[PDB]
């Protein structure tokens, strides 16, 4: 063990109800007792165990125990008193960022935290800024995320956005991945040319992916290269075809997206610089009437 992962007693956890389900397991809203002060709400991932093989759960627990920061989803500990194995995270009321975005999209149906309908520019910029900050932390630790996308971010009370997911994105958002052969799914629409062609993944590729996240944020969670097949999107990416500017996205933000989309990984801006630019724009949002 590389980190003293916290252990929660099974009695302290009360599963309220199921919030989602994947292949490796499912997510519950639950009531956890005696964590910080007093019966708080948490999100608990239960595994389905290939138990001896799914004991990489421990590794994920140690990593998540060490990988703690603002703008990264908070991890509290695990429970292994019996079956199934549980993993306890903080509850993020608005669910994943893509779901949130689509729920505030121009084409949707149906709050106390945020007005219904389209977000303002400052809000989109704030979301982007927060994701970018999470990435600044990760790059700082020489961590390569490898699946950066709104679906793998979570939105909490007061529009707090953090990087994080429960490992179900390949089940829930199967369309966002391209199946290669078998038992391997690639988020191609979010990947730079060097990840696709040369099969290399670095902090710079995460920068590209973040460009794509920006595009998602300004299209309210629409899929990149939608209406194109997987191979068609691949051809696009490897031929230097950029994503069009979203109608809600001002030119100054599209320039940032384009900054992230330099073909040569060394020519892309650092995640810190992108974060700074986005934070500045969020501090003084540019007028854009479309």
> Is 64 within any annotated ligand binding site?
no
> Is 25 within any annotated ligand binding site?
yes
Nearest CA to 132 among 234, 281, 250? 281
Query: How many CB atoms sit inside 10 A of residue 35's CB?
Result: 16
Q: What are the φ/ψ torsions at residue 186 (nearest 5 degrees)?
A: -110, 130
Nearest CA to 124 among 208, 220, 190? 220
Do residues 231 and 188 touch, judged by C-beta distance below 8 A? no
Q: What are the φ/ψ torsions at residue 241 (nearest 5 degrees)?
A: -80, 115
Catalytic residue among 12, 56, 147, 235: 147
Do residues 233 and 172 touch, judged by C-beta distance below 8 A? no
> Is 18 within any annotated ligand binding site?
no
Q: Round to whole Å and give the CA distance between 111 and 147.
A: 30
Do residues 130 and 141 touch, judged by C-beta distance below 8 A? no
Q: 């703690």: which residue's tokens?
A: 68
> Is 144 within any annotated ligand binding site?
no
DSSP per residue over 220-234, as a string?
A: TSPPTTTTS-HHHHH
- Nearest 5°: the CA angle 129, 21, 178 is 65
Do residues 145 and 135 touch, judged by C-beta distance below 8 A? yes
- 147 is a catalytic site residue: yes
> Is 20 within any annotated ligand binding site?
yes
Beta sheet of 40-47, edge-to-edge order = 13-21, 25-32, 40-47, 86-90, 75-79
> Is 27 within any annotated ligand binding site?
yes
Do residues 223 and 98 touch, judged by C-beta distance below 8 A? no
In eight-state DSSP terms, residue 8 is -
> Is 45 within any annotated ligand binding site?
yes
Active site residues: 147
Q: Which residues are annotated as a binding site?
A: 19-27, 45
Q: Which residues are annotated as a binding site for ATP?
A: 19-27, 45
């Amino acid at each position: 063990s590389d980190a003293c992962v916290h252990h929660i007693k099974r009695r302290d956890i009360v599963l309220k109800w199921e919030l989602g389900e994947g292949a490796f397991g499912k997510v519950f809203l639950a009531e956890c007792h005696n964590l910080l002060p007093d019966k708080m709400l948490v999100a608990v991932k239960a595994l389905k165990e290939s138990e001896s093989a799914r004991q990489d759960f421990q590794r994920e627990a140690e990593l998540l125990t060490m990988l703690q920061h603002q703008h990264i989803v908070r991890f509290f500990g695990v429970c292994t008193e019996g079956r199934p194995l549980l993993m306890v995270f903080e509850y993020m009321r608005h669910g994943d960022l893509n779901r949130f975005l689509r729920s505030h999209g121009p084409d949707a149906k149906l709050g106390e935290d945020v007005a219904p309908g389209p977000l303002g520019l400052g809000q989109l910029l704030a979301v982007a800024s927060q994701v970018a900050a999470g990435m600044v932390y990760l790059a700082g630790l020489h961590f390569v995320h490898r699946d950066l996308a709104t679906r793998n971010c979570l939105v909490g009370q007061g529009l707090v956005v953090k990087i994080g997911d429960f490992g179900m994105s390949r089940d829930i958002y199967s369309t966002d991945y391209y199946r290669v052969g078998g038992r391997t799914m690639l988020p191609i629409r979010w990947m730079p040319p060097e990840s696709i062609l040369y099969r290399k993944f670095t902090t710079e590729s995460d920068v590209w992916s973040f460009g794509v996240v920006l595009w998602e944020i300004f299209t309210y969670g629409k899929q990149p290269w939608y209406q194109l097949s997987n191979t068609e999107a691949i051809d696009c990416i490897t031929q230097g075809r950029e994503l069009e500017r979203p109608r809600a996205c001002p030119p100054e933000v599209y320039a940032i997206m384009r900054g992230c989309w330099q073909r040569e990984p060394q020519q892309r801006h650092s995640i810190k610089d992108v974060h700074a630019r986005l934070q500045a724009l969020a501090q003084a949002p540019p007028v854009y009437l479309d």
